[model samples]
Target: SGAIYVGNYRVVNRHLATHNDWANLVWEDSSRDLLVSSTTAQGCDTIARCDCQTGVYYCSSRRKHYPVSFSKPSLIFVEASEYYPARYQSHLMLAVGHSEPGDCGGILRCQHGVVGIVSTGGNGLVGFADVRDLLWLDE
Candidate 1:
């Protein structure tokens, strides 16, 4: 199948021509549909790239090119803090964006101070940590 390439990354699709408005994904130009400019995509502050030959998507910031292992059925957007000072390097407060599972190896969802848990495939479920009962506000 022919493929669409962007930012050193590629997604395989035989219907790139017919699926012009699919999910609102577009190339800057029809002729150069495979090359997405590094300066425009959402991750300018981070290293983002993908291989046209392989489906591997790479992203990172300030240190290395972190690998994104999976893609979703469609793209979703997330935002992050502009000034993430390094003081709390080991802490996670607000999640600005989200995608499929990564090296952490599972899907997670949080809503209204509750964590949504699901079976990994019904064949099994990934190990989980429940923090709904542990949101100690620095007492």
Candidate 2:
């Protein structure tokens, strides 16, 4: 987990969230937290963000939050699985430049448990790669 943005390798993990909704939260803390948006998720190929600060999952484009559940969601569609697949070693490559934010969505999935938070154990649905948002600094 020796990952640093623009400096050292960054530690990538799942940005697992229980709820995904639309909410404008400007709360800050000495500790690092998640960010979510309030954008409606497209039926297909559309993702959103999940905030760890206020537990608000918002959207990137609409600046809103989506609807996720603390009760294990039906599916997972985050990044850890998309970028790194043990099945395909050749495909286990990370495109930091290509990574997106969670105020909209991160690399989440259902098959792989990277979406749920630690409270949900390693079987998380949403996972992260390079946190440290381009907009704000992480801790």
Candidate 3:
């Protein structure tokens, strides 16, 4: 998640891909803003190297912050059988028993390292965008 504080408000700029929900964060120098970039069918280093079936954790600000606040970590079990629907290979869906919103740009980390960025979730299933292969180009 490419989130930053401007004045007193938090802003997130979303960069949608041509297809699917895959996205990553990008920092804009000209605008002085943070943006999320996403694309489908692109295999990231973390996602391609690590085992998707492994358990992961993400922090949520839903419970503590009333509307928004500090985040607390929660365990996430990856569903080996279910894959997110996309044109090409999509994200991994979480197993049953976890719920939260306002965490769209939250980072997903495994014991190995960062795996993805939260993109969408519903019905106890959460999905994220791969980030390991993201290229940070200088302008």
Candidate 4:
């Protein structure tokens, strides 16, 4: 088996070439599929690359925090997750954008309200005050 890239790869894009449409999840899920730019620490704030075909993820935490660990499934890290800013982020549209409002600039779902996983900052995510609830793929 080879690999499949599903970044911005719509589930219903008639323009898809079929083979590129479905790849058997080559990349792992960081869980930050929703969220914008934040300061509570995350996995990656740059090009958090994940190969759905490989079932793994690698998020470079820039020069600010520790880079996340690669795994068959993927690890959930507080300093490792997508967090795009609001200016270049948007959800619920025929065309999906790059980063999100709080995304760190990566390829994942675009939204908010903690749908995946992330670090709970001063206010905390949901009700977790440890921010340890941050999600990733490491199994």
Q: Tens digits of per-residue lDDT for model 2 on 1-139?
A: 1112212112122233224321322222112223333233222221223332212232243444334433322223322333233221110212112222332233332221223212111232322221323333222
Give each prediction's root-mean-square deviation over alpha carbons.
19.3, 16.2, 12.2, 16.1
Q: Give the TM-score of candidate 3.
A: 0.40
TM-score of model number 1: 0.18
Per-residue CA lDDT of model 3 for 38-85, tens digit only, reads 323332333323544444545474532111111222323432222222
TM-score of each: 0.18, 0.20, 0.40, 0.16
Q: Which has the higher TM-score value, candidate number 2 or candidate number 4?
A: 2
| Residue 108, candidate 3: alpha-carbon lDDT | 56
Cα lDDT tens digits, model 4, 1-139, are: 0111222212121111135333433322223233222122233222223322211111223222211221222322333223422222111111111222232222222122211221222121110111113333211
lDDT of 4: 0.22
**Looking at candidate 4, what is the lDDT of residue 15?**
17
Instruction: Find the candidate with the highest lDDT and give its number.
Output: 3
| lDDT (10s digit) by residue, model 1, range 1-139 | 1222224322222123234334344332221112122223322111222211112221111122222222221122222222222222111112212322221212223222212111111112121212222222111
